[PDB]
Each structure stands twice: as structure tokens, then as C-alpha cells.
Amino acid sequence: PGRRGSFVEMVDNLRGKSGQGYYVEMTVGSPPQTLNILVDTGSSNFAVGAAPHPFLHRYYQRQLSSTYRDLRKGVYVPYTQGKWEGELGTDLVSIPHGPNVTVRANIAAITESDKFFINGSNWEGILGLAYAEIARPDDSLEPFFDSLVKQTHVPNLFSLQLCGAGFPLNQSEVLASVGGSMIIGGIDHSLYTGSLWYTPIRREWYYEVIIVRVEINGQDLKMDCKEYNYDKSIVDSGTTNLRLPKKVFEAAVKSIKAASSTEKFPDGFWLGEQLVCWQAGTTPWNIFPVISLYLMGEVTNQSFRITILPQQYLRPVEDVATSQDDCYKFAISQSSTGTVMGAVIMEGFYVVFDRARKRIGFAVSACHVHDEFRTAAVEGPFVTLDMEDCGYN
Template identity: 50%
Template sequence: MRNEKYILQRQIVTILLVTNLCLTSVLGNLPLVKRNRVAKEDVSRASQLQGNIQYGNQIGNLLGRPGEGYYLEVEIGTPPQKFNVLIDTGSSNLAVACKPTIEISTHFQTDKSSTYKGSGRSVTVPYTLGSWNGNLGEDVITISTIPDVSVTANIACIDKAEHFFMNDSNWQGILGLGYADIARPDSSVEPLFDTMVRLGQSKNIFSVQLCGLGYFSPNPNNTVGGSLILGGTAPEPYNGELFPTPIYKEWYYEVVIVDIEVADKSLDMDCKEYNFGKTIVDTGTTNLRLPYRVFNKIVQHIVQELQLNPEVVPPNAGFWSGEEVLCWKEGQVPYGVFPTVSLVLPANATASFKLVISPQQYLRPVGEENDNSPENDCFKFGISSLDSGSVIGAIVMEGFYVVFDRENKEVKFANSTCRPLDPDTVRSHIQGYMKYTGDYNDCAYKKVETDNKTLTIVGYVLAGICGVCILPLFVLLLQWQCRKCPCRKLKRSNSDFKDLMEGSS
């Protein structure tokens, strides 16, 4: 009897442990309820409005310096305070320095703006290199080149930054032009451009022309310049046809690369490798950045092409890694021996086109402070590796006019009218259309995500399993209680007495 009771107790303890594990699993997998979620307003109506923006006024509104990005002048607050903000399609927050630092010449003084309102929320934004943190608020924002358009929008006051601002870069903040899904700390922080669209101040489209060091700037007051056209496209920055590629996912401007070529020869890699992580179009990144395996394959193919010319000694490993510069005597850069690099993008289910990037584009000129001697032209390799996907950065975009057509969910490319300093320069250009027989969706990186509906089903299944686990427990408990029942003991006593009486007779 003692052994039977001991075994019963062990069975109960075991079932209790299994039940606890089942319940923990159910609770851990049931979908979480999002609280205080801010509903997104429907912005499609704004895309149908003509808006008040005069596109011609925005030609040449971007300034910049080599390797330091392109910036736009904005006015913030009442009365307005002027600042330059880096344009960045790889983030979504408008942020400006609100404290003095040694790297910048001016900062936003919130106490001098009668329309500034703080929200009491803090925010931190990390980038591939650098980060900043500060506090969220809102104020009146005006783009200097479209003064008739002012909106009250979200703004972050930067209190602390690490490896973000650059000495004498002449910009004091950043204008994120990405989707609200990547806004920090969450998507309830509406980006400036989204606010303009929602209020009918702009169509849901903008376009960018970047003219790097090898071109005449559309802004005559700066070495490097370009145009950010909010609300549409303008005829001046491009010629020829606009070639569209679908936006695969609306957070960053994520697109899909279906092939990469060097000297018109495919790398012959699985197209998923080109997009491993994601592929985005980002004005805030200088280089063309690619996953490690793809980067190494490109370098291998470029070296093979250079070795075809016996008079050329391929650069050493330090150049390819971006740690060293490569210099030639002024005016004697052998652009002709370096091959083109092409990104093949899908236009639709049956056609594709190439962004043909010339050596003048990916051999990135560096400032004079990096020159070995003043009579030399020195360059860095404008293609680099990345562990989180591919980035079509400024060195690519400087060869093209790029339209972010959010209304039609497309990024469009056209040949740029940026005029090269050297008339003999081989221009980056678009080649297309070409027949495409694959499914570009198969090339995209797909992160496995479990939605709430799936989690709910899993939760119910686990609950059912737990029910099956718990049922034996109840049976055993019932049996145990029955064994302890006084009436059972009385019945057993009466039976024993009857046996005893029968035995004695």
C-alpha cells in the first residue's frame, strides 16, 4: 500500500511539471496585445492633390562635400532658425542638434521658438556608423526652397551624438525620407514628408539628383551639389526614359537585385545572395555596399579584368578593403582599364534593366588631405562589404536621376544630366529593357515572420495538448480521493468483518 501511494504521488508530480511546461508554452506564444497603438491616417487622398510645390525652385537646392553627404536648408520654429540637414532615404526621423558641440557651428534653440512643443519622449537612432539620442517634440518646418509650404511636424532634438556629426561638414541635422515603419522609437512618429503628403502639401513622390566631384554642380556655390524635388519630377535633372523597379517592401526603399555583372559578365551567383538581408536605395550611404561573398566575387572579377592588360598591376588588398588610397599623376588616371560594374534590376515580371556603373563612379576621389602629393589624383574604392545586405548608395546614385514614387510603389532610374568636368568621361548609363524570365520575388530575402493569426492557432493547439496532459491528473486525483473516502473505508471494514465472521463459523 505504501509503494502504491508513493507511485501515485510521483505520477501526480510528473503530470504537474508537464502541465506547467505546457501552460508556459501557451502563454509564451499567444499574441501580444499592442497598447496605445496610433492609427495611421489614410494618405492616399493627398497623392491626388496637385500641391503647392514649384519644382523649378528646387533645382540645385542640395549642397555637399566629398564623402560627407548632401544637405538641404530648412527653417525650424517661430521665428525661423535656419539649419542644414543631411538628406537620408535610409532613415525616417527629422533631427537637429539642440546643444553646441565642437563639430557644428550652430544649433536649434528651442526656448527661442514660440511654437516648439516637447513631448517628453526620448529617442535613440543608430546608423551603420554612429548614432544620436535626444528628445521628441514638434515645431513648424519650412523647406527654404519652397517657402510657401510650412507644416507642423515631428522633430527630434539631438542632445548627444557619437560619430555622427563631422567637423566643418556644414550640416547640423538629418532629414529622414524613409517610411514611418522605420521611424524611431516607433511608427507613431510621423516623418516630415508623410506629414506634408497627409496635409495635401505634396504628392506622394520625390526625386533626387546627386552630382559628385566629377561633375559640375547644379548649385554654382558649392563643389558638390544636387537637387531634392519634393512632390514630383522635374525635366532638368534627367534625359531619356525613366526605368521603374518595384519597391519590394515599404520601410526602407527595399528593391531586388536579380544579377550583378563585371564587364558585362555575370557573377553567376544565386540571386538571393545579392539581397541577403535586404537591398535598399540610400542617399545617406556613400558606397555601393554588398554582402561579403558578393563583394569578394566582384573584386575577384575586377582583378581578372585588370590582369588582361599586362601593363597594369592590380592594386593591393588595402585598396580593395578601403584602407588605402590609389594615386596616379594628375590627368593620367587609367579609367579605361577598369571594367564597368552593372546592377540588374527587374522592371516587371518579364523585363529588366541594367544600371551600368562606370569606373569614374566607383573610383571615388578623396580630398586633398589624403593625397600623397598635390600633383597626384588619389582615389578610394567605392564598393565595400556589409554584413546586413546591399546598399545602393551615393556613388551609384551620382550617375543617375532617382525617383522615389511611393504612390506607385516604384523606384525609377534615368540617365542624369549632371555635366562631367571631363568631357571625355565615360558616363554611367542605363541599358534596357532586357528580357527577364525569372521571378524576382524568389531573389528577395524573406525573413520568416509569424503573424498573430498563426500564433493564435498555435496557442489553441498547445492549449488542447495541455488539456490532454491535465486529464490524467484529474483521473488520478479522483482515484486518490476515492481511496481516502470514509465510506470506502467503512465498506472495507464491513467486508473484513464479514470475512472474519464467515471464517470463524
């Protein structure tokens, strides 16, 4: 059958890009104050700029909201990239291109920050979509999505289609372009092709999953599967890269270098610091390998795999000389806090965060970037044994 799209009001409600984040429009307070908010499945606090900042064009003004409630408590959140400090309160919140509901939610009003806001990102806050376990100050601060589900009839699920352009976008182009969809309360069948395959959420804190095998162009990386999930593996729209545990990163880059060895790239490229450029239209996608991550299935002893292309893990960037060349940075990097399946990997797929059934679904995205010879893929099943042993304790 033809796939129908039943969530038209929410399709195309995101803007942004992998490097600076994808955001959704929200309103806070009464009368409504419109703010653009970063969608972050890797944290659990809803927070907004609430004081002037050189990178903010607007911010939440609590004194102008008749529905604001002061919780008289400070909050601090330290992320990988940056950090902020603020003041807790609650207020009425809505998503204009979302469900037609208004809920009272916890809001951290950011008063101080460091390396948090991004110049020209066009967002002024963050929506942490993960679970209360990782909320600051503690798990008693109910996250936004929990409030939404408790106060309304919205089903306990959301899905994300992050759309990478495959070329650079300046601030103006981001403003005028659609960056994807966040479907709150459902799955929109127009956003993917093929089947949805589900992996269990191991524990409800981050959106933690278990990787059981890694291949580079079909070649098994052949590491003990616990290495892939040391000390966790998470699905995170708030991180740009695919980040891998140090040892896995070292093995994967050695394999990616070997597969792409018809061209030599500088160390700075592989360290994700330096861009590489090709003459317009000549990027040699075919010399770079595909990367497959096998994920634990819902059926005992079954796994499935998701496969990405270099069009996902090579992130388009503007040249230092703004020429006609096509330039990119390598968007796979090392981590000391486990695997992070960031935005550049989520760009290949429509990802379903099925909280009700404690599982994450993946399907090939209808907006993934590819070429005439290869596409991203989601395939299965594979008979995989002792998959629970892949989890790190």
C-alpha cells in the same frame, strides 16, 4: 521633344559630397532657425543638433521658438556609422528652396551623440526620408515626408539628383558649389537624359528593391540572385559606398581585380582604406570595368539594368601631401546588412522615389561624371524569369 525643367525653385538646392553627405537648407521654429540638413533616404527620423557640439556652428534652440511643442519623450537612433540620443518635440518646418509650404513635423532635438556629426560637413541635422516602419522609437512617430504630404497638396513623390564633382572639394568649395537637387513633389526633366525605368519598392520600410543580375564589364557574376539581396537591398543617400553582401563583395572584387589586372593595387585599396594616386589627368579609367546592376521591372518577367563607371565607384579624395596628383578611394565595400546602393551609385543617376506608385525610377543623370568613351546607362527591357525568388525572406 526637348526636355523642359518645371521645378526651377528646387533645382540646385543641395550641397555636399558622397563622403560627407548631401544636405538641404531647412528652417525650424518661429521665428525661423536656418539649419543645413543631411538628406537620408536610408532612415526615417528628422533630427537636429539642439545643444553645443565641437562640430556644430549652429543648433536648434527650442526655447527661442514660440511654436515648439514638447512631446516629453526620449529617442535614440543607432546607425551604421554613429548614433545620437535626443528629445522629441514638434515644430513648424519649411524648406526655403523647396515647396512654398510650412508643416508641423516631428523633430528629435539631439542632446548627445557619438560619431554622428562630421567635422566640416556643414550639416547640423538629418532628414530621414524612408518609411515609418523603421522610425525610432517606433512606427507611431510620423516621418517628415508623411507629415508634408498629409498637411499640404504636395504630391507623394520626391526625386534626387546627387552630383559628384569627380575631383576633391574642401569645406569652402562645398560651401560655394552646387551638389545637386532634391525635387519635392515632382520629376524635373532637365536633370536626366534618356528614359526613366522603374523598379518596384518591395516593402515600405527602407526603400527596398530587388537586384536580379550583376555584371562586371558584361561578365555575369553568376551568383544565385538571392545572394544579391541578402538580407535586403536598399537605395540610400545617407551611405557613401556601394555596399554589397560579404559573399557578393568577395566575388565582385575578384572580378574587378581581374578586369583591372594591367595594374596591381594594394589590398588596402580594395578594402576601401587606402587611396591610390595618379599623375594629374592620367587616371586610367579605361582599365577599370563598368558595373551593371539589373533590377526587377514593373512588367512581369522584365528587368532593366543600370550601369556605372569607375568615375562613380572611385571616390575622389585629397592626397595626404595635397600635390597635383588625382587620388581616389575604392567606394565599394562589404556589408553584413544587405546591399546598400549609396551615394557613389546614386551619383550616376536621377533617382525618383515614387511613393504614390510604390516604385523607384532611374535615369542617367545629366550631372554624372564620365569620359569621352563611356557613359553611365539605364537600359532595358530584358526578359528575366522568376525575379520574385531573388527576394530574401
